[PDB]
Amino acid sequence: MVLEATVLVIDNSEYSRNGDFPRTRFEAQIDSVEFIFQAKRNSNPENTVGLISGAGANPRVLSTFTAEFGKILAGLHDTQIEGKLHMATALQIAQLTLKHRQNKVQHQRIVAFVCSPISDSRDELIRLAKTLKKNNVAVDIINFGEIEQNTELLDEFIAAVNNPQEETSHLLTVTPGPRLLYENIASSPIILEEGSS
Amino acid sequence: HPLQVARCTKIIKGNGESDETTTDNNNSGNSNSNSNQQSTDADEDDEDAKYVINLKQIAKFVVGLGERVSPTDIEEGMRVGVDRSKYNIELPLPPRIDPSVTMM
Amino acid sequence: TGRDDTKETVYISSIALLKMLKHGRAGVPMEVMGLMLGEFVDDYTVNVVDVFAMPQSGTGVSVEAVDDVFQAKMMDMLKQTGRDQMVVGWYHSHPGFGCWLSSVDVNTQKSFEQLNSRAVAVVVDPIQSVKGKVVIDAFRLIDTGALINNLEPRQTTSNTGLLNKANIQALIHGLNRHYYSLNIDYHKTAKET
Amino acid sequence: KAQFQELDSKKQRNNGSKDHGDGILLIDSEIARTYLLKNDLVKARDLLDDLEKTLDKKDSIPLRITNSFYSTNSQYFKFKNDFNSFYYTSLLYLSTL
Amino acid sequence: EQEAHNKALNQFKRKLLEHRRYDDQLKQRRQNIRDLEKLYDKTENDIKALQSIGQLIGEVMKELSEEKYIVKASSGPRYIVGVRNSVDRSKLKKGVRVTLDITTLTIMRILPRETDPLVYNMTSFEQGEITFDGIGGLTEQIRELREVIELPLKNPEIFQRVGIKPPKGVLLYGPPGTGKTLLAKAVAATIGAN
Amino acid sequence: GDDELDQEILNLSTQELQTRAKLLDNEIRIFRSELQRLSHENNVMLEKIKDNKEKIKNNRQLPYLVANVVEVMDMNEIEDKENSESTTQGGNVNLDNTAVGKAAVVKTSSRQTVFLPMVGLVDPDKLKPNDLVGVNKDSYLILDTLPSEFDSRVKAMEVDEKPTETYSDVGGLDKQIEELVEAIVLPMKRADKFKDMGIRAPKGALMYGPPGTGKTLLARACAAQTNATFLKLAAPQLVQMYIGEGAKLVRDAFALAKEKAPTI
Amino acid sequence: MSLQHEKVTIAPLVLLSALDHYERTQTKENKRCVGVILGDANSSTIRVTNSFALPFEEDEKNSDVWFLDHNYIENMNEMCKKINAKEKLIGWYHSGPKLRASDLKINELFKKYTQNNPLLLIVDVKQQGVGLPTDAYVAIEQVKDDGTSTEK
Ligand SMILES: Nc1ncnc2c1ncn2[C@@H]1O[C@H](COP(=O)(O)OP(=O)(O)O)[C@@H](O)[C@H]1O
Ligand SMILES: [Mg+2]
Ligand SMILES: [Mg+2]
Secondary structure (H helix, E strand, C coil): CEEEEEEEEECHHHHHHHCCCCCCHHHHHHHHHHHHHHHHHHHCCCEEEEEEEECCCCCCCCEEECCHHHHHHHHHHCCCCCCCCCCCHHHHHHHHCCCHHHHHHHHEEEECCCCCCCCCCCHHHHHHHHHHCCCEEEEEECCCCCCCCCCCCCHHHHHCCCCCHHHCCCEEEECCCCCHHHHHHCCCCCCCCCCCC | CCCCCEEEEEECCCCCCCCCCCCCCCCCCCCCCCCCCCCCCCCCCCCCCCCCCEEECEEEEECCCCCCCCCCHHHCEEEEEEECCCEEHHHHCCCCCCCCCCCC | CCCCCCCEEEEHHHHHHHHHHHHHCCCCCCCCCEEEEEEECCCCCEEEEEEEEEEECCCCCCCCCCCHHHHHHHHHHHHCCCCCEEEEEECCCCCCCCCCCHHHHHHHHHHHHCCCCCEEEECCCCCCCCCCCEEEEEEEEHHHHHHCCCCCCCCCCCCCCCCCCCCCCCHHHHHHEEHHHHHHHHCCCCCCC | HHHHHHHHHHHHHHHHHCCHHHHHHHHHHHHHHHHHHHHHHHHHHHHHHHHHHHHHHHCCCCCHHHHHHHHHHHHHHHHCCHHHHHHHHHHHHHHHH | CCCCCCHHHHHHHHHHHHHHHHHHHHHHHHHHHHHHHHHHHHHHHHHHHHHHCEEEEEEEEEEEEEEEEEEEECCCCEEEEEEECCCCCCCCCCEEEEECCCCCCEEEECCCCCCHHHHHHHHHCCCCCCCCCCCCCCCHHHHHHHCCHHHHHHHHHHHHHHHCCCCCCCCCCCCCCCHHHHHHHHHHHCCCCC | CCCCCCHHHHHCCHHHHHHHHHHHHHHHHHHHHHHHHHHHHHHHHHHHHHHHHHHHHHCCCCCCCEEEEEEEEEEECCCCCCCCCCCCCCCCCCCECECEEEEEEECCCCCCCEEEEEECCCCCCCCCCCCEECCCCCCCEEEEEECCCCHHHHHCCCCCCCCCHHHCCCCCCCHHHHHHHHHHHHHHHHHHHHHHHCCCCCCCCCCCCCCCCHHHHHHHHHHHHHCCCCCCHHHHHCCCHHHHHHHHHHHHHHHHHHHHHCCC | CCCCCCCEEECHHHHHHHHHHHHHHCCCCCCCEEEEEEECECCEEEEEEEECCCEEEECCCCCEEECCCCHHHHHHHHHHHHHHHCEEEEEEECCEEEEEEEEHHHHHHHHHHCCCCCCEEEEECCCCCCCCCCEEEECCEEEECCCCECCC
16 A cells, blocks of 8 residues: 555564475565565555564564665564464554654555464454554454465454445455465465555 | 964874774874775865974974975974864964074 | 843753762863753743763864764753753863953854853762852853944843952953853752752 | 574575474483483483583573473483482472473 | 476576576675674774874883882973872882883883893894704803803792702803804703793 | 596486485475575674774874873783772773773873773784884874884984905905805805804804904905995994983894894 | 572662652552663672663553653663663563553563563652562572462
């Protein structure tokens, strides 16, 4: 989306250990994190992107808004790769990042990859959905990590956040096996996704 | 005024003095350069003939080139005016009280 | 007429007093530079809330002795923490000499006058101070037009009129042809005490 | 032990993270452990003291790593029948479980 | 031909050079990270020196008190200074060389006793020295010099035990050319004394 | 002959080589991410240095005082418990910051003796007894190094080599000419043979006999040929009434000779 | 690494700065002022020489959410070495007076700028204690007795 700031979440997990894209899902995610960053810059050049960890109980800020690809790239290697995603904590820590920004003319976007299903209670994300859309924050969930064998708990959360205002949630369905992850991003909306009026 | 009066006791060239000492050796730097072969970290310094003056309280200082004359005019054994505390040649003074004395 | 041209009561907070002494005493035998950040209110009241030290300069105190890279960056950091205030003056030391402005320091005051025309210049000796009341005086320029036509004094109205002064030397010569001195007033609460 | 020493020459570089040296120390507790049962107690002792050294220069030491170390140390003491030396070592094993 | 792996291989040939090139570069770039590091530390060490600042030397002229010393500054005037927590008063004594912070004029640390440049030239002399054992001959004479000199320096323990006074002083005299210098040069190595 | 071509069809199977190739495309993707990572790191790191450099450039700038290094005293790292100082601080190992290890003591031309923390800018190997040094005017820190100046006393004594006079032009006295060649040139040129053998090259040759027998002409010829400097020293001068002054120039001439060595 | 923090000397600059800094963010009602403290560390005596604010948020809904700006800590380091190289990050003040368990996790963050364990300097700005205007604690990791786990 044009005129948007985005907090990437790299999923650090033991389902990211598991290989379902080359070399493993972690090495797949380096390539897809580079993809989105540049695509979004071209479409609007004021766009600027941070990175935070999906690891442990606490997500840590690896990068703040920046348009050097090198600062975001560096954090992908540095972070510990074995962890667990915690969606609830992520939404809130991502939201703080979207608070503290160069100009709030931009849309508040969270793009969050899923390799590992939720490790938290369902209902907490339902309550948090209404707080997110209250400040006009949307959350894009890339799902290849809950359709392996998992039933999709993701869909109901996207329903709750979605409501046209200026920002609308999307659910990027990505096939679960090798095809290269970056390409799956590309075939899903990622330069034509938008918030609706 | 006041320019405290000093006098040149040495012509030490500016590219032979080795002001830079990170990659330069004391004997000379290049003899016409000192840090013009370094532009990898951005530091600039060349100058030609910086002189060592001797103050009349007998303190020695490396001082500037002329800032109101060309350095050609400033020589070995020539008196010079330098600032109160910024010690940098502004105006040269004649080389001593020698005229008129000699001519008689 | 025009400007009030009466010399400010400078209210230096406790934090700002101790901070100045800290940077000055480490740096002896050398000069130190720095910018004073506060709020100006009334027509003669400046409250110097905080300070920041400008790194040690290789040419000493002068009109080049603020680098615009440090300055901009430093104020930018105060803006991210809400500690932001406006440059209302500048401080500099003479490390071995009592309070006065040399030719260079007055010329620096002419530059700070441009930016804020109520600006203060504070001269801190770090080592001569054993009380810590002493050898800290603030100066502020009185208009040039004021000097010529002899409308120079106008600092004795709208103050206490208790003055504290000593020395002829440079101090006094500085005073006659340029600036006016007034004591440093210390502000505190009972939480700092 | 060969696999992991080999592995970190490549892996650390490509991956850019992850240390596999944690696991070396359990293997090492187990080499002493083999020595204990075979009745070469003397050999096992030296390898446990060389293990201990590595532990101290680690910033974070997970509980599992030091748990095995103490298990081994416990076995050593009861062969001598030093009741006191076994008792004090076993409490730490129990706590760090 | 009939193969499409024959068509594939042409392309695969181009690829080959690419791996080699990338490997060359990776190895260079790590070495570069290290090289810039050393340069960076050293630039930063100048800056630690600018904030550390010089110090003043004097000498303890006379002890006034444990916590007060008469020092005579090199700059000029005699001073009464304080003693820092850091310098111990066991180190302080009269006539020892001292150094002090410029700031508060408080004794920072003591100095070792400095040497005038005349006597430095004498000390500095070393030719890389010689053996015992390249002074050969007049064996018995070499042995006795060792008996006076070397024997109480290494072992004063035997001399204290017996309760005899340490033996000290030797005078050497002989013809020119006999190697008093050669022996002077030799004895100095053997024992290792300054 | 290489790899990934028709040579390899014979070494390794057509299916197996082709599937190697696909594997080796993956390896590029991994190489690119690593390579860029190392690249962006150098670039970033480079900027930090430029920042520092500029800070030092202001200090390096004129004026600055001139001092001379009396001696160097570099203290040991860990002289104390954890300090390169000779006093206690509870830790920190530094050479010019919290703890002073290396130091140079300089004597100013302002008549002061000052103990300085060594500055990282210069080498401890340049800093000798009487190295002329630039020192920062304000706070005193060794800023830079300067060549040594030499007095008029130094000048007379030293190098007054004129190109070879040539022995053809010093007529007669065949034997004297024969002796000088043997004494000087043969060791200087054939030093390698003297070295392998371990014998010493002549300490002196005494020349004696009445004035005007050519001797001057000859040493001046020999010195240019042998590529040693010509020093001019005359003993009747060095006899003085002042004990100090008279002793001084012997000591000066010995130190300067060894310096300007090889020298005649 | 060292476990050396046995004595903590405080300059009075630190206690009045923490008093100001709370009020320059305007944190209240168990919101906190989290900033850095600089000084010397890796040593038996710690001298807490200086203090600065950092950008920081504190959420009352869950204590495992707070904000911190990392880029601020990296940029403040460059600047402070120029003023004084004897100043380095030695840990963090926290307004308190209540010490919490989530503060262990903030602690971990600060362990990536200083080699030693970070010092968490509780400075009460509310002035409820008539003594202790400084209490100091350091996070250490040890097997706790009585069948208890390894606790941080
Ligand atoms: N063998 C010679 N052939 C030519 N002229 C000579 C010869 N020896 C001496 N002279 C002349 O006499 C001068 C004095 O001799 P010089 O080499 O200076 O001697 P000494 O060291 O013996 O006092 C020479 O400058 C030269 O004019
Ligand atoms: Mg002799
Ligand atoms: Mg002659």
